[PDB]
Amino acid sequence: GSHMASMETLKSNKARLEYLINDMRRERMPSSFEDLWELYRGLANVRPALPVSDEYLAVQDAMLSDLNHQHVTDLKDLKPIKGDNIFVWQGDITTLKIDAIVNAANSRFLGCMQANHDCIDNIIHTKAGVQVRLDCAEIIRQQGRNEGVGKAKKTRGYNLPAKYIIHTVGPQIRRLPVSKMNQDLLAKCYLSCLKLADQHSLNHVAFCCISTGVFAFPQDEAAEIAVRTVESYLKETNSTLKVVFNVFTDKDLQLYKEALNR
Ligand SMILES: [Zn+2]
């Protein structure tokens, strides 16, 4: 659309940010969209999983839906890289129209509560909306305990173009040469996500690159386990599931291409 329309939407979303920031400050400022967004994000990140105002949710949803759909990529417009069911796509996972995306969660399962942390959990929760945290809190409440490694739980995607978010907890990697045990645990994450998708009759799922951070699984070995586990699953089951390997960097892109090049 026009630059003019773009500037009006920006103005509206800055006003929505100010609104949401004010609510979170008062329940218990800067000028640029960039600075407002980081202020909002930090407040959202650290907020305990308690009920919100329904007016808050109306404003939040208007903002997040708008932001997430400004430049949507539809999986139907992508072409497979291997067979007819495996894709590698460079881009923002919160802007991909697809039945499910996979979130690398933590055991507390409420998302990232580290203000402004650069991790995929933070990104997915903050773009989807607070409902994802609230729904995860209810999953944990009904379960009676925090979430183990290598499992999968589904929530709605709310403001994401993705219909659902599949949440899995991966292993922490504290030793340089990744142990066999941790390799098996990562594979088990992939397998649980794939099975959950098929169980709920989803047509497609996207996995993300591991975000770089302390004790994150090394990218190289991660890609190899991802590809190996997905390919074994699709062979052994004759699943019609389509799988997308999402990457962000040019380097991660080439990495996954190689891993699929046999
Ligand atoms: Zn985080």
Tell me, what is the CATH class? Answer: Alpha Beta
Query: Which architecture does the CATH hierarchy give at level 2?
Result: 3-Layer(aba) Sandwich
* Strand composition percent: 5-15%
Span of the ends, CA to CA: 43 Å
Protein name: Protein-ADP-ribose hydrolase
Domain Macro: 73-262
Function: ADP-ribosylhydrolase that specifically reverses the SirTM-mediated mono-ADP-ribosylation at an asparatate residue of GcvH-L, by releasing ADP-ribose from the target protein. May play a role in the regulation of the response to host-induced oxidative stress.
EC number: 3.2.1.-
Structural summary, described in words:
It is classed as hydrolase. The entry lists the keywords Zn binding, lipoate binding, ADP-ribose, hydrolase. The strands form two sheets. A six-stranded mixed sheet has the order 2-8-7-4-6-5, with helices on both faces. A two-stranded parallel sheet has the order 1-3. 48% of the residues lie in helices and 14% in strands. The protein has a single domain, classed as Leucine Aminopeptidase, subunit E, domain 1, CATH 3.40.220.10. With 262 residues, it is of the alpha/beta class. 35% of the residues are buried. It has helices spanning 3-26, 33-46, 54-68, 120-128, 130-143, 180-199, 219-237, 250-260; strands spanning 73-74, 86-90, 96-97, 100-105, 153-156, 164-169, 204-208, 242-247. The chain is globular, with a radius of gyration of 19 Å. Helix 1 (3-26) packs parallel to helix 2 (33-46). Strand 7 (204-208), helix 7 (219-237) and strand 8 (242-247) form a beta-alpha-beta unit. The protein contains eight helices and eight strands. Zinc ion (ZN) binds at residues 112, 114, 117, 119, 121-122.
